[PDB]
Amino acid sequence: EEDASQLIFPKEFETAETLLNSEVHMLLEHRKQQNESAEDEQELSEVFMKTLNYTARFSRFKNRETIASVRSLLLQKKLHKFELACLANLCPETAEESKALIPSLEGRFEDEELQQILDDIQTKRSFQ
């Protein structure tokens, strides 16, 4: 019934906002600092831990401010909450690839423009 490749999502996830793995990581990092300090609270869940590591391991923008610039950059482009977060997480490098991974992007922009967005994202990438 649902299919992200056509931006067909369930109702529940409509009024929702997407999060980059980087943002998730930042948020989870804060929740940990809270659990750590201020005792009288059980260790966090396995689900947390696994998400904390996965998220970190795939965070492409390690700086808080950087993250915001990526978000805003894409934000001002006719993109779906899903499409935005997906471009930031997967960072494809070419429009072709881009369209392949996120078919919903087809026909939204000229390859030229789409390649601009991809290239800008790469620029914010906090390589290592």
Binding site: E2, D3, A4, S5, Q6, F9, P10, E12, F13, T15, A16, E17, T18, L19, L20, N21, V24, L27, L28, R31, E41, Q42, L44, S45, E46, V47, F48, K50, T51, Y54, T55, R57, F58, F82, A85, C86, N89, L90, P92, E97, A100, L101, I102
Partner: protein, 171 residues
Amino acid sequence: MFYHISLEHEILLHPRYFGPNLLNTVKQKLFTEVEGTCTGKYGFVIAVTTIDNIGAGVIQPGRGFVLYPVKYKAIVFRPFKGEVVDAVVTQVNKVGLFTEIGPMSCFISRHSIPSEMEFDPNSNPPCYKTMDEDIVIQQDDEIRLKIVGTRVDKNDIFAIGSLMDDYLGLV
């Protein structure tokens, strides 16, 4: 995909357990009941971001405990069919690829792996490679997959993936 959404949850408490500070108790009980849980509807509740509001306690003659409705912001992970995600390979087997995306497991059927990737049991760490040894996928490698189906067995969700499309595979 990760989302930041608003969820609801009811906390039931008999007076005897209000603790020195109720609001805190309600809050501590909430974190404990929802964090780590999973549903087919919203998926994995990764963590409670904020407690927006604690409704007025409900006292319905008959119950001896009071029901406190709670609205909160949480980070959830809800995969969808058609979504492309980066995964971590946890195991190479002659049956396929067992990977993990955050808290959710995802299985890539050998049948859903391009034919150029022959299976090699004899390889040091078992793996899938092109006869060309050009591309090699093994345990702990990061790969890109397209989720083909999702399942919910006992409130926990898991998925099935494929490496059949273009621009998928080794990262």
